[PDB]
Amino acid sequence: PSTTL
Amino acid sequence: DYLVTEEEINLTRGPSGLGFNIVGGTDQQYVSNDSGIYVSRIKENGAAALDGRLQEGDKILSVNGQDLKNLLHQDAVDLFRNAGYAVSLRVQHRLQVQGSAYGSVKAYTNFDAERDALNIETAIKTKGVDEVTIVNILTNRSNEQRQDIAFAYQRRTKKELASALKSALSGHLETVILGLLKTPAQYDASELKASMKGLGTDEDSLIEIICSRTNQELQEINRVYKEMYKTDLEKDIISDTSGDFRKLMVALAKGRRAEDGSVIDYELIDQDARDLYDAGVKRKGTDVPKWISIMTERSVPHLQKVFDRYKSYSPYDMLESIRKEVKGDLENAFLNLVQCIQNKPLYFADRLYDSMKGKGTRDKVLIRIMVSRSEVDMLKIRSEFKRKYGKSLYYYIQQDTKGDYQKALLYLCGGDD
Ligand SMILES: [Ca+2]
Ligand SMILES: [Ca+2]
Ligand SMILES: [Ca+2]
Ligand SMILES: [Ca+2]
Numbered sequence A: 001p002s003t004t005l
Numbered sequence B: 001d002y003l004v005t006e007e008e009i010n011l012t013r014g015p016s017g018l019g020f021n022i023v024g025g026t027d028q029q030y031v032s033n034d035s036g037i038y039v040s041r042i043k044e045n046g047a048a049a050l051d052g053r054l055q056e057g058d059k060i061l062s063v064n065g066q067d068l069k070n071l072l073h074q075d076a077v078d079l080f081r082n083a084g085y086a087v088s089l090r091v092q093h094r095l096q097v098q099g100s101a102y103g104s105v106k107a108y109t110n111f112d113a114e115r116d117a118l119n120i121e122t123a124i125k126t127k128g129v130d131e132v133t134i135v136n137i138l139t140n141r142s143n144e145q146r147q148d149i150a151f152a153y154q155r156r157t158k159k160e161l162a163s164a165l166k167s168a169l170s171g172h173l174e175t176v177i178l179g180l181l182k183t184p185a186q187y188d189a190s191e192l193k194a195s196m197k198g199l200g201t202d203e204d205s206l207i208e209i210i211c212s213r214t215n216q217e218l219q220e221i222n223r224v225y226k227e228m229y230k231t232d233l234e235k236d237i238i239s240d241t242s243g244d245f246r247k248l249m250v251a252l253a254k255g256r257r258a259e260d261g262s263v264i265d266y267e268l269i270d271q272d273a274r275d276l277y278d279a280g281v282k283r284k285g286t287d288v289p290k291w292i293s294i295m296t297e298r299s300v301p302h303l304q305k306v307f308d309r310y311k312s313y314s315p316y317d318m319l320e321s322i323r324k325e326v327k328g329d330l331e332n333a334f335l336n337l338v339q340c341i342q343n344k345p346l347y348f349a350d351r352l353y354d355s356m357k358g359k360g361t362r363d364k365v366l367i368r369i370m371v372s373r374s375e376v377d378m379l380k381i382r383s384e385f386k387r388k389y390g391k392s393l394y395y396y397i398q399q400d401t402k403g404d405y406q407k408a409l410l411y412l413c414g415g416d417d
Helices: B047-051 B073-081 B113-125 B131-138 B143-157 B161-168 B171-181 B184-195 B203-212 B215-229 B233-240 B243-253 B266-279 B288-297 B300-313 B318-325 B328-342 B344-356 B363-373 B378-389 B393-400 B403-413
Strands: B002-012 B020-024 B037-042 B059-063 B086-096
Touching: B002 B047, B020 B073, B037 B047, B059 B073, B113 B131, B113 B143, B113 B161, B131 B143, B131 B161, B131 B171, B131 B403, B143 B161, B143 B171, B161 B171, B171 B363, B171 B403, B184 B203, B184 B215, B184 B233, B184 B363, B203 B243, B203 B328, B203 B344, B203 B363, B215 B233, B215 B243, B233 B243, B243 B288, B243 B328, B266 B288, B266 B300, B288 B300, B288 B328, B300 B318, B300 B328, B318 B328, B328 B344, B344 B363, B344 B378, B344 B393, B363 B378, B363 B393, B363 B403, B378 B393, B378 B403, B393 B403
Parallel strands: none
Antiparallel strands: B002 B086, B020 B037, B037 B059, B059 B086
16 A cells, blocks of 8 residues: 555 | 665655655555555656655655654654645665676677677578577677667567577577576566466475565566566465465565664564574474564574574574474475575575486576576575585586587586686
8 A cells, every 4th residue: 555645 | 785875855845746655654564574664656747756866665764854763654644744845855775786796697898789689690590500609699698688689689580589599499408598588587477487387386496486586576576477477476376375385485475575674683583583493393383374474574684693593592403493393395495495595595506406416407497597596696606506515516517418508508607616
């Protein structure tokens, strides 16, 4: 699970 | 092998956002037991890309002065989502500056891809095939130069170089040359794919590749495997192995071993050593999952120190402990893994000796090691081989193989002693 910033 | 630099990066959040993704946290560990926050992706025309300083794989130490140490994933995310439009990051880079320094095959300095392609075409088409010229060229160019040769060959003949060589070559020489024409990840992926035959799976080849490749190599293998075969490597492992052997292979194939740390964690070294003893020789039977967790999760330098501390507690070292505790494919996998951790060049030197010492040759193993390690650590393999066996790797290859096949392997060896 990667999170876009 | 690697270098670490730290740097403050100041970004302005534009209409497209900061333009990068993060992974990590105490509950979403990027690699095993690592709680750090890492950049996983950098979007084009985003703030981070247009600044140029941030890089994928970077560790983010702090945001606007707030340390990202031992945070939940969500708490790190919240620090970014609640930051202003002026974002200050302190970041740690990891740079690989080794290359082919310990490989026997180096990039050819006067390389000309079009010239090589023409001379190989001529050698292919001369009456009887000029195998000597084909071997002389391809074993004296780096892998990436070989890719340029193959591109120039296809452009001028309208035929693939590997297809032409399949018709021109045969025997073990064909196996060597075709292997050299694949990229390292393609070669490893294809060797793994070939070893998975359901109940007829070649566990020894599976073990050799999965136990010896690093995180970065395995990540590329996983990507290329999926492109080539339209299925994830892990799924093929799951459907072609069973028991604790499968769990060990799956864990290793993820390529998420803890990375090399700056601080040596002596307390954990001792605790891991006690755990290995308590799970094996100290008890009746074996707690195999505890062995798998420790040996697949900790960094290679950490485990090297663990195996020596293990001797403080156990009457037997780690290798003889494995022999006493487990059997079959599981025993063979642990034995290979521990050798890979303790001394990887010596591991390959011993596998090369085993492939030649007796009647005939295990050419499949010999070729694969000579192809796959020639641009990595063949010089270290040769040093360990000579130190242990007295004669050189070159000498044993010379005694066990013949012809143009022999000549290709000796070029991949790179020299005597
Ligand atoms: Ca010939
Ligand atoms: Ca052929
Ligand atoms: Ca036991
Ligand atoms: Ca032999």
